[PDB]
């Protein structure tokens, strides 16, 4: 467990500027013209197979509608503003610059400020948490507390910069951030996790039991062979680890695996080659947009994947998701946000055996209807012994806090209140 | 088992037109300006990791002398004339204009011209044959027969059309293929392929053993090189958009693949090494077979429909096996008679990779003429 390993350019190791500097998100005028003329000299794409939908991947003909509306209606000034509404910050750890928004409340006598660590995921950014935020730093008044929330870029993700050698997995980013937490001054924290923010943030609450005082997840899930075991157990007889009612969420496994050798194909490929596929998607506003939008149609709800539009209109606006997008345009890190899932299938990484050592710090978890993945409390509780709650939701999918912001505080906030009542 | 399956546009079906066409492949000016264009305004590409060379995939420090290479000193129009130094033709078998190579050569009294169908695989096309084509249909004075070759290219490939509904998987390309022989007057003929060819060859050898009187297959750290495949085979439509509207992500998506299965090694080296065995204008003349026919995602189509609950047996004519050492899946010669119980050799080359006939032309040539010859011999 090295805590000092250093990610960016050997040489400034002696000028490291460890300071915290304020910083605005830029759509700067050449960018815009660049992206609107690229945009506008496209290619025509092969005609799609008719009456498909969306099941051979993103339906080329909902391209001129979606190209059009981002070269011609999207805001590009007002957006820049809407990203500016909160503070952001840099400063570098080990190396890289890392980025993160930080939104404190002011809270009257008798209100404590609590630090809330905020984990966003791939395809996601920090942007997936902005409708979020109010509800999470509100003050209510049947809480003793108000968050605090610190939201960091990811390692190569949005404003952050990537690292420069080999090595940089999930467990190496829980160091990152832990070393972020005690930069700005923090000795105690809750974590809130999903997709690799659930990951990293596991690993967490795994080295730092100390540090950490409560993790969340919305994407609570072993990969271990005594879960896979107690998995293909509960298939002879299922009503020894899982409830009826939520029985179908798991069962058949037939269907389970099915459809993931169905999804998992970005993984497959991010995890081996992710300096080729990534490269098409620097270069071309089309590429990316088909390669990102077909994850926000299919995680959100996979029933989807039948509509000939997506139905990417299911849940957000245009802008909305063309926000998201330009955080991996503008800041070119396609490639560099892929890069984490080849470092993490390492045979390295894997042999630290994240799977197999506990997590002794208290736990809830969110599982929304529609999430990719589902495991019962009773396979659960072998990585978080110390699991306070499972909360079941009868909608939603992956992109939880992006698509039912007043349902994901209001469940971070309970978890949180149950939390302080525990530690007496 | 059907033989009338339909696969282009319906319409066609009661005004279809069965006259062989010549064709001729042309750069339009207006293509080659646009891809100029398109290279020059180029974006800056991510650094690649530290002292890690094709290990990620495509190292993108490559990306410039490739690119500038293609934008200014790749000769577009002689290129269009190396391509067409061998006649073309188009024909609509079930709905689709499928292209074909078609080279005969000229015969003296006592010679048989024996057809042969030689097939490419993806992320290949006809452009593999070129150069192994002169030695193939070499007339000999020492053999009492010269080889005619039919090479076309795949549904989707090239300049051959794409179905317009699902269900072709390469099972349906060995009925196509069937009746593209037929058409142009064969009642038998040999077959060669790799890859999807080896696949399509050996599925039109156990369907229609009567008219393949030969069969010559050249496909008889794993894990780590199939990620192409399970995209392809799942959501080919969404990584193929990307592809189709950047010359760099087409070149850094096909030649990792000329990098890869010709010698795996190679992956360690920071340039691909994509020196080891062709010329610059020899790999983008097969990316232009891609790039200017916009097929990319037609091509991986093929992959999708091939791994289809409906898609997923012994060949009874005579095999010849050709095998690389540096293929991705060597197979020991004991179970290679299980699948093929008419096994006539199996030639094993200690150099060579994926790539046979466009890695190593003559070798190629003169194992296909061996074992044909072989194959005429056995009958009696």
């Avoid at 910083?23 to 008719?50: D, G, H, Q, W, Y």
């Avoid at 011609?72 to 990203?83: D, G, N, S, T, V």
């Avoid at 894997?350 to 710090?361: A, N, T």
């Amino acid at each position: 467990l090295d805590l000092e390993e250093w990610w960016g350019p050997p040489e400034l190791k002696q000028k490291q500027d460890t300071s915290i500097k304020p910083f605005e998100i830029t759509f700067s005028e050449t960018m815009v013209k660049e992206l609107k003329e690229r945009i506008k000299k496209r290619r025509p794409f092969a005609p799609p197979l008719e009456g498909v939908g969306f099941k051979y991947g993103f339906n080329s003909k909902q391209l001129d509608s979606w190209l059009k509306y981002w070269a011609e209606e999207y805001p590009f000034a007002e957006r820049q503003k809407f990203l500016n509404q909160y503070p952001h910050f840099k400063t570098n750890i080990q190396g890289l610059n890392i980025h993160f928004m930080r939104i404190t409340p002011k809270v009257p006598k008798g209100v404590e400020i609590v630090p809330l660590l905020l984990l966003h995921g791939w395809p996601g950014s920090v942007r997936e948490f902005y409708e979020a935020i109010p509800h999470l730093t509100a003050v209510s008044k049947d809480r003793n507390f108000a968050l605090e929330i610190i939201a960091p870029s990811l390692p190569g993700y949005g404003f952050s910069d990537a690292a420069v050698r080999p090595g940089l997995a999930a467990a190496e980013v829980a160091v990152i951030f832990k070393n972020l937490m005690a930069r700005l001054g923090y000795k105690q924290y809750y974590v809130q996790g999903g997709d690799w923010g659930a990951l990293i943030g596991s690993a967490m609450a795994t080295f730092f039991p100390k540090e950490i005082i409560g993790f969340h997840s919305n994407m609570a899930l072993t990969l271990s062979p005594a879960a896979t075991f107690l998995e293909f157990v509960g298939a002879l007889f299922p009503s020894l680890i899982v409830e009826p009612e939520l029985a179908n969420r798991l069962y058949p496994l037939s269907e389970k695996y099915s459809t993931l050798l169905e999804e998992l194909g970005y993984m497959h490929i991010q995890a081996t080659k992710p300096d080729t596929v990534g490269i098409g998607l620097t270069d071309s506003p089309a590429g990316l947009l088909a390669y990102i939008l077909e994850k926000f149609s299919t995680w959100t709800n996979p029933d989807l994947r039948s509509k000939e539009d997506g139905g990417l209109s299911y849940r957000w606006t245009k802008d909305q998701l063309i926000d998201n997008l330009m955080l991996y345009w503008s800041t070119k890190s396609i490639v560099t946000s892929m890069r984490l899932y080849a470092e993490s299938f390492s045979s390295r990484h894997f042999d630290l055996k994240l799977d197999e050592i506990q997590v002794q710090v208290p736990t809830w978890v969110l599982q929304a209807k529609h999430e990719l993945a589902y495991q019962p409390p009773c396979i659960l509780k072998m990585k978080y012994p110390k699991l306070v709650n499972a909360s079941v939701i009868e909608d939603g999918g992956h992109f939880l806090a992006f698509e039912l912001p007043e349902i994901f505080a209001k469940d971070v906030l309970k978890a949180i209140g149950e939390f302080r009542k525990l530690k007496n």
